[PDB]
Amino acid sequence: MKIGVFVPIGNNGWLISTHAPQYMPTFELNKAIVQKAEHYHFDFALSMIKLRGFGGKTEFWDHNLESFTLMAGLAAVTSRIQIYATAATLTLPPAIVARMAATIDSISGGRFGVNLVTGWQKPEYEQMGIWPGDDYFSRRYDYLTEYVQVLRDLWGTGKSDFKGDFFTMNDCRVSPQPSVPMKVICAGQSDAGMAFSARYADFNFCFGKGVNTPTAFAPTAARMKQAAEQTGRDVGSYVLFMVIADETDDAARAKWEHYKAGADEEALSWLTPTSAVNINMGTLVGSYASVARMLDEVASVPGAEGVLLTFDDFLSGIETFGERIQPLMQCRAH
């Protein structure tokens, strides 16, 4: 099973709590995170993009770096881990993304990939008046499809003449071309989404579900595996969890309750037994060995190729995972 880290590109990571570690997303923090991750043989790092926050006492995700520049910087200070940036396709022309990815390919030596995102919240895009109306809700995938087609032309051959409803290319050039085949990623959960993933993505990101119910996401992995049958393409699931670990189950449970107790509820309304303190993320709470066991249970779901991990505390989380969780995991004995 592959393991990656979901790097905090917004403040306070994935906890909306006054009891959660409070920190700003800085390059040097992310640098320290990816370098630790690389040290413990994590396979990849991924940064979302978030163009607007949810306010509140903690000002959750009001401070957010830009993904392609953050990963170009992380690329220049790592050597082995895989680096994925997220392009919000409404805000960047495909030809630019294409060139940006060639560029981070050059920095990283073939370690870069791109995570293509529709955009879901209207506020992110209306705020800068580029949201294309409510037609987009059920037509993003038609848009995304033309988009990916321009990228493939440019990475593939270095030119594109694509003519569709949304883009017009007239001998568009982009060289150099990526030194390796350019990995693309998607995180659609809908039928459209999976359909897209199966055609063009190299793996699909889905959400873990429940506290301490590791294999609860299995349906969606099964659905993603079904959608992949329809294109004959090997397109695995990579599931997002928050790990809250400790030396014992009681200890870890105590951290978890502590976080949920300090919920920033003003910030939680703007968004609107799992807790919304991590946006109802799938969470594994327990001792190092409890958590190792549950991840072993994740590696055994059909479709599951890897997990994408957040922590309550990234620097110690990545360390405890490296030192105490990983080496008890069957699925990581290589």
Ligand SMILES: Cc1cc2nc3c(=O)[nH]c(=O)nc-3n(C[C@H](O)[C@H](O)[C@H](O)COP(=O)(O)O)c2cc1C
């Ligand atoms: C690991 C992961 C990362 C994601 N990153 C982003 C992101 O960076 N930006 C974003 O707008 N949405 C992001 N999403 C949300 C999805 O792109 C998507 O909108 C959602 O899961 C619903 O699926 P659909 O688009 O097929 O309806 C992410 C989802 C997952 C599982």
Ligand SMILES: COc1ccnc(OC)n1
């Ligand atoms: C948990 O991370 C998530 C979840 C949902 N949507 C986004 O980005 C918009 N990020």
